[PDB]
Amino acid sequence: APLX
Amino acid sequence: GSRRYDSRTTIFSPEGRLYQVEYALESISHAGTAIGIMASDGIVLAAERKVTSTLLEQDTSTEKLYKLNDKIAVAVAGLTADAEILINTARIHAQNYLKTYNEDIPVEILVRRLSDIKQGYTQHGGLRPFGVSFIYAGYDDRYGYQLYTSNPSGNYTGWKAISVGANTSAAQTLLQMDYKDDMKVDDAIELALKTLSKTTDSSALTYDRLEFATIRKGANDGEVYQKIFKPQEIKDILVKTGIT
Amino acid sequence: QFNPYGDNGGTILGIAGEDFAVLAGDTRNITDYSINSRYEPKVFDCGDNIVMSANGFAADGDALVKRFKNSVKWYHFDHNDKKLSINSAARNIQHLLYGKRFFPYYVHTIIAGLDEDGKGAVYSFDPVGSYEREQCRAGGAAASLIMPFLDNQVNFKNQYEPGTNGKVKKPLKYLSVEEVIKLVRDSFTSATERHIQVGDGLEILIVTKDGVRKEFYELKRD
Amino acid sequence: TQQPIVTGTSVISMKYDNGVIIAADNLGSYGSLLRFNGVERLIPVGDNTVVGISGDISDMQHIERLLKDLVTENAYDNPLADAEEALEPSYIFEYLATVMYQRRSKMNPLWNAIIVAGVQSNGDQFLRYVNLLGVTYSSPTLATGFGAHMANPLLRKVVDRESDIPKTTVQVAEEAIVNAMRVLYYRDARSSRNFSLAIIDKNTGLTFKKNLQVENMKWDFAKDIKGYGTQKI
Amino acid sequence: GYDRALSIFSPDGHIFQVEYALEAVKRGTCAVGVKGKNCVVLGCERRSTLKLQDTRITPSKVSKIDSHVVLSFSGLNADSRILIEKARVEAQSHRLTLEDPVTVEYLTRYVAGVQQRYTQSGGVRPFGVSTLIAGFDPRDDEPKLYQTEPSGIYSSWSAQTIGRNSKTVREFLEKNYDRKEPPATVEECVKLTVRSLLEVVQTGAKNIEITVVKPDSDIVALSSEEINQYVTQIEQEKQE
Amino acid sequence: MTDRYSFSLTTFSPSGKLGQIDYALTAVKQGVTSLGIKATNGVVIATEKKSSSPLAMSETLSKVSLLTPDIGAVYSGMGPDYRVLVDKSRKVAHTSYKRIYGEYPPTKLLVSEVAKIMQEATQSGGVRPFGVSLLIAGHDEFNGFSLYQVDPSGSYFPWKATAIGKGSVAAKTFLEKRWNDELELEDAIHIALLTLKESVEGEFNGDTIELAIIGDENPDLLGYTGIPTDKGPRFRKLTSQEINDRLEAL
Amino acid sequence: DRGVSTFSPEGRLFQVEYSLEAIKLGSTAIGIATKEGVVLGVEKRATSPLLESDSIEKIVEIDRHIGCAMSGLTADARSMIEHARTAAVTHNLYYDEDINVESLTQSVCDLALRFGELMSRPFGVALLIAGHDADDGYQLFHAEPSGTFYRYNAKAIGSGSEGAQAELLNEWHSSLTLKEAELLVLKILKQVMEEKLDENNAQLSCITKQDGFKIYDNEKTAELIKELKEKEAAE
Amino acid sequence: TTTLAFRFQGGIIVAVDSRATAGNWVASQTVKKVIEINPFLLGTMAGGAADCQFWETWLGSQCRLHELREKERISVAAASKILSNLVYQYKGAGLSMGTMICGYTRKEGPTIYYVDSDGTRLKGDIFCVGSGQTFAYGVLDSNYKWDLSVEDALYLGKRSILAAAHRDAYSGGSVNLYHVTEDGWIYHGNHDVGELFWKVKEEEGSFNNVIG
Amino acid sequence: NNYDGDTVTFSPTGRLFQVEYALEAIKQGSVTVGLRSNTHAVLVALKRNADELSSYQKKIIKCDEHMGLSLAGLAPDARVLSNYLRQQCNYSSLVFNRKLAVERAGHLLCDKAQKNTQSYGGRPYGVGLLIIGYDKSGAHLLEFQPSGNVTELYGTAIGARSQGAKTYLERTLDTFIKIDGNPDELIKAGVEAISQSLRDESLTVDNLSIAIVGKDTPFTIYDGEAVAKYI
Ligand SMILES: [Mg+2]
Question: Could you tell me if B202 and B51 are in contact, meaning their C-beta atoms sit under 8 angstroms apart?
C-alpha cells in the first residue's frame, strides 16, 4: 500500500 | 428452575436493613466476649472461650486470637471457620503490600480491605455473609497504636476501648466508666479482665477459659512486640490482679 | 512454506464522464505462465447503480465483492430500502478492506457509478482501504502502462494551447461516452501488446441513470 | 501450514455439446515412489456431478467424506431430494470453494486442486475449478498440474471458445481427452498408464468408466536413437 | 455467576429494592450541603450514642475524590466506600486521558451512572446511599453542588440535605436560603449550614462536622472549637 | 443444563442459627460412636464397625483411614461424606504441602485444610454441609502427638480425649474420670476399649471394633531399607487378633 | 416469585406491563411534527424550589439531526441515549452520511427486550425521538420498553398524557407552522401541569433541517409563554 | 510526504503536499492529506495512506462523541491523546503514521501536537513531518519569525512545501494550505506545483539550480 | 395455574401454559391472511394504529428476493425471527449458491422456537408468522406458531377474528388455488378473505398492506397509494  | 430455593441473601427489608447482616449479628451476640483496650504505651486483647470441657487441650489451642503480621493481631467473635478464611486472606494481603512497597502495611489499609470483602458478600453473589466480627489491634508509624472493629456488614470503626460478641452492652458501659486516656498497658490489662469477670455468663473467670494478648513497645527501643499469653501466663496475671 | 496469496493478473480501468461512468477490465485469468481462462469476468453489477472490480488475487477479489454485495443487501434491510450512494459505498468498502489490515485482501479495488447530483464518479482503493474519488484510474498488472496515458488523454496533462508559449494549459472538459470507450479500447489493446498477463477479451460496464449496460470486445490471445 | 505427502497428478476435463467429460489417472505417488495404484480420484455426487481431485490424497479422502455427508444432509426433511431439491453441480462447487478459501484463510489449506464437472438441472454444462488458495475459474477446458501445461493446449484445439461447444460431439471430445492422457503418460514422471473417465450427459446421464489404459503408443523410433551426439553403434 | 434479577418492577410500576435502598438512606445520619457566593460547605451529623470512639482514625464522612472535589453521603457506610473508590479511580483516569481534572458535574454523572447500573444488573442489589458532591471545576470559581440517589437520578442544588430528619432541615433551608443572595462569605455560609443542622442534631458538640471547599483545590475541615464557636454564637443570638 | 445453583443453601435464620449446620450435627448425633484418646507416647482412635447385613464383609469397609504415614482419621455421621473427605484430605496433603516442602504436613495444618473444605460446603453455592464430624489423630516432629475434632461448620478443636456421635455424652463423662497426663499408650488403648463397650449393643470383638494408633515408627512397615533418615509410618491399624488379645485382659 | 420473562394469561409480559405503569408516573413530555420542524417540550417538575432547575435535563441531543425527550425513570435513559449517539456516529463513520431517524429508533428499540435471567429488567422510561432525514422528512417516534415504536404526528407521554393526547387530537392539522406548534406544546403543557407553567419548569426544543437540533434558552421560551397568554386573552 | 504546521503571532499555518507513492510508482498526485475534524480542529497525514486516513476519520467520530457527552468542544490536547493512546495500543503491529493535530480552543489558545505510530506525542510551535520534512525545515527555519504577517506566514508555509516537493522525489503534486485562528480554520486553496514552481522561480528569482 | 410459572413446567394434563399464553398474544394481534395459487403467493395484512395521530404498524417483512412473511402478535419477536430467516436464506446463497427452500425455512423456524419452550430462563416467542415464497418447487405458504408448529397450506389467516377469513378461504379453495398467471386476481381474493374478519372498520389506503411473490415477481410489498387499486 502507498505511503505519503 | 432453581429460583424456587433461593433465599436472596443480599436484599433490603422494607425498612432498609439487610436481613442476613442483622441475623449474622444476632449469631455473633451469643459468641464468647472479646475486648480490646488501647493505652498510650500498648494494646490489650482479651477474650472468653466458648464454654470449655475439662478435656480440651487448652495450651495448643487458638479460637479467639490470631496473628495477622508482626505488628497486627485480631480478636474473633463468631464462626471460627468463617474467621480463618478471612484471616488467611488478610495475612496474604499484608504480604502483598510488603512485597510491593517494602514497608509493613498500615493498620487501617489492612482493615479496610477485609471490611471491603465482607461488604461484597452483602451486595452481590447471592452467598451468605461471614458470621464474624473482628477487633483489630496493631501498630504502625503513622498513627501508632490502633483499635478497630469490623462486622458482617463490612462497616469498620476505630476505638480507644471496645467489646464484641456477648454482653457488649454491659461491657461497653463498664469500659466507659473506668477507661481514661493517659492509661498505661498494665492498667488496661486489669480493666479488660475485670470487665470480663463481671459480664461473664460463667460462675467465675479462670485461666482455662481465656485467651490474652498484648502489643507493646516493650521490646527494645522504638520497635514493637506481640505477646500471645500462654495458659500459665494468664493464670499468673489473673492472680496478679486478684480475680483468683 | 504455504503462501496464502497468488497473482491472477489482468488489469482494470475506470473513467467518469459528466452523466455516466465506465468500469472496464480484461477477461483473462492467469497463474504464472499459464492461462486459466480467456473469459472470467471480474467487473460486477452490485446493485444500486454501482459497479465494482477488485483486481489482483482473484480469491480475495471474489470474497470482497461477495461481501460488498451482501453489504448492499443489508443496507436495504436495515434502512428502509434506501439507495446506497456511491460515496457511502466507498466508505463502507474502506472498512471492509481495513478490517483486514493485518492480513490484507491483495487487490486494487475500483468502483464506478453516479454521485448524488447525477454526475459520473470513480473511486479507487489501495489494498488496505485508502480511497479517493477521481475522473480516472487504471488498476492491476498493466496499471503502470495505462495510467500515464489517461493522465494525458483524460486530464490533458502536459498539453498546452498551441502558440500560447506553454503558458495556457489545454482546458479541462468532460468526454462523451463514445470518446471514453475509444480511450478504453485503445488503452487495453496497447496494454495487451506489452503485458503478457493482459489479453483475450475486454468487458466494459457503462453506468448511467437508466442502469448498467455491458459491451464486450475481443483482445489478442497470445 | 502443510506439505502434501501421498499425491495425485493431473485432472483434465472439457465441455462438449451435450455435457462434460473429466478424467484422472489411478495413481497415488509418494514423492518419486509410485506407491499406490488403485486410487480413484473421480468422485461422483448424485447422477449429475463428478468431482475430480489432484494433490494430497489424505485431504482428498477428507473431501470425499464431506461430499458423502452433504448428500445425506440434503436428503434430511426433503421429500424432493431425488427431484427438484437434488444437489446441483453449482451447489456442490460453491460449498467446496467456500471450504477451500476458509482453510487457506486459517493458514491450514486442503492441499488440492479440484475440478467440479456436471450438468445442471436445466441442461447447462457445469465446469469449474478451485484450489488450495480458494482461486476459482471456469473455461471450456480445465486441467490441473501438468494437465494445465500439456492437456489444455490440446483440448483447446478442439474447443477454443464458447461457440465451439455446440460443434463438439462426445466422440470427438472423448478422443481428445484420451489422447491428452497418453501425452501425459509420455511426459509426466508422476503419471500412470491406468485411469478413469466420466461423461455427464444431459440425456444419457452419468457414464463412469474404470480401468482405462493408454494405448496406441509410439515407441518404435527409440531403436534408431544411438548415443547423445557423435556415437554411432 | 449469580444471576437473579433482584431489582424488578412491581404491579404498580415501582422497583421496591430501589425504594427500600432509599429507606436505608433515610435511616442514615444527616448530611447537608450549602453553597455560598464563592464556596461550598458540607455539614454532617454524627450520631451520639457512641463514646469511646477514636476520632483520629475513624473514617470521616466527607471524602476527597480529587483535590478540588469532595463527596459526602447518607446511608450504608460500607456501600459508600465502593462508590468513593470507583469515583477516585475515575478522577485519575480522566486526568490521564483528558489532561484535565474532572468537572463536578462529570464526576457526579459518573457516580450516578454506577448507582443506576446496580438497579438493572443481575445478582446485585442497589446502593443504599445518596451522595452530596461538591467543589469547583478546574480554572473556575463558580461553586457546584450536586446530589445523587440509589435510583441513579442526579441534579444540582443551591443547598440540599439528605438522611434522617432531612425534611426538617430542608424545611429550614427553603425559608432561610435566598437564591438572589447566597451566603456572600465563608463565615456567613458555614453559619447557615450549622444552623440548619442544629434544627435536628442535639448539642453542637462532637455532633457536627463541617468541611469548607473554596476554589483552586482549597479544601479544609474545621475542628471542634472552630465549629463550637459557631454553635455558641447562634444560641446567644437566639434568646430574643 | 449445568449448575444454576450459585447461591448459598445455608443461610442465617432470624435467631442467628445456621440451619443446615445444626441439622448436619443432628445427623452426626445419629451416627455410631467414635472416640480418640491422647497418651504421652501415642494417640488411639476407635469406633464400632456396625455392619449393614451379616452377608457384608466389613473389613472391606474401613471407617479408620490413613491420611499420611503419621496421621489417621475416624468419623461419626454419614459414611459416604467421610469417604470423599478422606480422598480430598489425602490429596491436599500432597498438592498444598508435600509437593511444596518435600515433607508431610503437621497434624494441625492438615486438619486446617480439611476444615477449610468443610467450611466451603457451608457457604459456597448449591451445596449442603458435610454430615460428619472427624477425629484426626497425628504426629509431627515439632508438635509431637495431637488429636483434633472437626465439625460440619469447619470448626476444629484440640482434645486430650473425646467422643462423638450416638453415646458421646456418656462416653465423654467416662473419659473425664479415667484420663490423666501420664497415660502410656497401652493404657489409652485399654480405656478406649472400655469406653466403647458402653455404647456397643451386640457382639464386641476384634471383628466389630475398628481401632488404630499413632505411635512409634514402624520400619518393618516401610517397604524398603537404605535411607536411615526414613524410619516408617507412625500410623498403625490394630488387627482383629491384636484387639482380641486386649479384650481377654479387659 | 416468578420469572422476569413470564407471560400473563392474557399473553403480555408482566415486567413490560409494570414498566408502563412507572412511565405513567413520569413528568409530561410532548412532541409535535410539522413540515417546518418538530417541537419537543417537557415538564421539568423540580421536586423542591432549592434544586437548580436548569440542571434538569429531559431533552437531549442524539446527533445534529436527531433529538430526544424522555418520561418515567429518567436515569434508565442514560444508556439508551449513549447507545443512540454511538449508533448515529458509527453509522456516519461506516457510511459517510446521516443515519435515518427510523433506523436510529429501531436500534434503540432493539435494546428494550434484551432483559432476563443482558440486563435484569426492562427500562422504566419512554422516549420521544424526533429528527429529520432526506428520505422521510421530519419525524416523531414514541419508543416504549416493549421494543415497539410508533411514528406520530403529535404525541404526549407521562402523567398528563391521556388528557394531552385528546387535546393534541383536536389541535393537530397537516399545515401547522413551527411557531403554531411551539405555542401548542406550551399551551397543552400548562393545562396538564400541577404547578403554574413558566420558563423555569418547562423547556422547549426543536429540530429543523437547516439548523438541526436546538434546545431553547429560558429567555426565548419566556417570550413564547408571554406570546401564548396574549393569544388566549385576545379571544 | 511532506507536511508542516507552525505557530505564530496570527495563529497556526498548516501546509501539506498531495503525493502518494508505492515504491517509485507515483500512485496519486491528488491526496487530501489534511483532515477537517471540526471547524476548530485539523489533522495532517503522513506514513501509511490507509492507516492515516482510517484512524484520523475515526478520530473525528470520537471528537464528535466527546461534544455530545460533554456539551463542549474537545481540547486539542485530549483529541491528540485519543489518537496517540489508540496507536500506542497497536505498537509493534506495524501501523505507520506521522500526524499533527492542529487547532484552537479558548482554554489552550492555538495549539499543535505531533503524534506518531511509535506513540510519541509532543506539543510544539514548529513541526515538519514526512520523507520531505528536512527540506521543508531548511526553508521554514531560516525564514521563521514569531511576528510574520498572516500573508508572509501563508507564503512561507507554501514555499516550504514547494522546496520539499522539488528536492524530495516522494513529495509533489500540489500544496494545500490552511490558516487556523480563534474563529476556526480557513482554507487557502490548492496550489499545483506544475504552475507554482515556475511562478515562484520567476517572481522570487530563486531555483537557479534549474534550467530556466 | 400452579403450572404456568415458566415454560419448563408441564401441567398435570400435559400442557405448557406459557406456550399457550404466547399463543394468546397472537389472538390479540391484528388480522393477516395468506393464500396462494400455483404461480404466486400473497400476503394481506390489516395494519393497526395507536390513535389518529400515529402510523400503522408494519406487519410484513421481506426475507429474501423469493421469500417473506407477515406477523401477528409481538412485533419485536417477528423482527428477531425474520432476521434469523434473512441470515439463513443468506447463508444458503453465499455457501451453496442455492435459494433456500421455503420448507427448510419452515423447519428452521420450528427448531428455533422449540429451544425456547424446553429451557429455563428463556420464554416462548409471542408472535405468529405467515411465510410465503417461490422456490424450485413453486409457490408456498406456511403458518408458524411459537409452539414451534409450522404448517404448509394453500391458504390461512391469523390474529383476532381470523376465523372469518379462514372459513371463507376454506370454501373458496377450488377457485383461488387456480388463479394462475394473474397477480391482481389472487390479491383481490386475499383482500376479500381478510374482509370477512373486519368489524366496525373497513380497509383504508393507509390501513391495508399486501405482498406478493411468484414465478417472475420478486417478493415486494405494497402500501399507501399503491394499494388504492384494491380497496
Ligand atoms: Mg498480452
Answer: yes
